[PDB]
Design a protein around this ligand. Sequence first.
Ligand SMILES: COC(=O)C[C@@H](C)c1n[nH]c2nc(N)[nH]c(=O)c2c1=O
Ligand SMILES: COC(=O)C[C@@H](C)c1n[nH]c2nc(N)[nH]c(=O)c2c1=O
Lengths: 263, 263
Amino acid sequence: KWDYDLRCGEYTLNLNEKTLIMGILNVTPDSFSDGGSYNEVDAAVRHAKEMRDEGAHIIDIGKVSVEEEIKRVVPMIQAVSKEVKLPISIDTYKAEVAKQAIEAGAHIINDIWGAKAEPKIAEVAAHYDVPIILMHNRDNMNYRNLMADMIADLYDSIKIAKDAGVRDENIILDPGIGFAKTPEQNLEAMRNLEQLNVLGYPVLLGTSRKSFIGHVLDLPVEERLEGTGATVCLGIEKGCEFVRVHDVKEMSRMAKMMDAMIG
Amino acid sequence: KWDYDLRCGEYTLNLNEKTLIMGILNVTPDSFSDGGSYNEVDAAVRHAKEMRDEGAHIIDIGKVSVEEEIKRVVPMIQAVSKEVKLPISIDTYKAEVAKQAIEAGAHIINDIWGAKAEPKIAEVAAHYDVPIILMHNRDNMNYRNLMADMIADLYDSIKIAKDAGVRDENIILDPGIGFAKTPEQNLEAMRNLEQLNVLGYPVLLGTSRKSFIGHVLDLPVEERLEGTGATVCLGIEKGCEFVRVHDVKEMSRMAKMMDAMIG
Ligand SMILES: COC(=O)C[C@@H](C)c1n[nH]c2nc(N)[nH]c(=O)c2c1=O
Ligand SMILES: COC(=O)C[C@@H](C)c1n[nH]c2nc(N)[nH]c(=O)c2c1=O
């Protein structure tokens, strides 16, 4: 299906052999600290190592200014990248934060605003030649046709990315579940996820422990592993290449079993 | 989709509103005992109650002779049925065991041999007017076309059932995952499960903690919740009306989330 590999500098990711697991890193910051403290960064590193040991293929790291956001995240990327042999993505929508994070050692950019909040981030991406995840987002829930609108919206991000020099192969899409969508809309997007495929890019799903799962099951954030699991399984069936998750152990197993079944 | 309800005597099951959960009952027998002992039956009852409390819609209860099999199972059905307001299925392929179990208070018959080991069980079913689950089974793995063969095989069971007087509405099918199939064949059957639907009957999936999950994940029986989960999710996507499971709590949540998503 994919005639290319996601090239991530020193690491290469194969889009065909298995669903790729993106682990979500704890960023619990130290009070008293601007960033880089031993407690912050060591807690971070230990979590990255755990996620690595549990089957994570990527480590995702990401109010508050840009000056600060950098002081916070840069020390973490520097440490995790040295100590965890695994590609790193920076979870930011800010061009300068993305620039700093890549200089620090991040391999992938992860923009929850699909390059629309700071189009210059697409230029950063083009320049450094790193994959960029463009997630579906908007400031309203005023759709006329959820999926058609989503696809139009995502496609507007593809345009910004390609206009900036981003190679097709460095583009990944994200339905932006839990964003700018009612609970019912999130379920509808899940139900029709396979439609994103016609756009011709790898798809990352990010549903981990989200509010719509709590809304279906009526369970708090810490009781959402089974709901996340369902969404991950459905997502894999519908052709997604990555899943962004907190529970790396559990979701790796479900993903692996799904992979085996869908052949 | 279903213009009828599964009628189970005092209980009625709706095939449309949600995936129905069949909990698998522990039958840990007492040594020294022929059956009916306080420890056996109380352990059984407590488990049925737990499964009830965890979201189970049916309680499934089932070397060794027929005389004995009855002495073992009958006391359990009598107690569980009195004390757990939930339909009960007897897991047997023996006509007389099925007869005794229904007299005891079982509502559904569950035949892993699809009425081929003891065709008279279909007559028991017709007579008492209870739903019967016909599972796919055979004494060899010598297929020419797994799915086509399976469908032919299941259909041979439908014939035995209908020839005996079994109303269409009292028929449920089961792909018989983990039976007469290599690991690779089990995965293939999972992958193509939706094909069972053309037969026009409700489908029950029974994959809980099975060996093929252990074979994909390389994990022991007690470490198979995530694998079971995957198979349950896939199965629901492919149109199954029931799932037969050990982990009632966890699988109820995954099922419920799947239901919400697939609308
Ligand atoms: C730990 O989870 C979060 O930090 C919650 C939100 C803020 C979040 N951040 N970034 C994301 N990035 C992609 N690509 N897809 C997502 O669904 C997503 C999110 O849901
Ligand atoms: C606790 O699990 C078991 O007792 C293992 C086997 C023996 C088993 N018994 N009956 C079944 N009945 C239906 N309908 N579908 C099944 O997959 C199944 C089975 O897998």
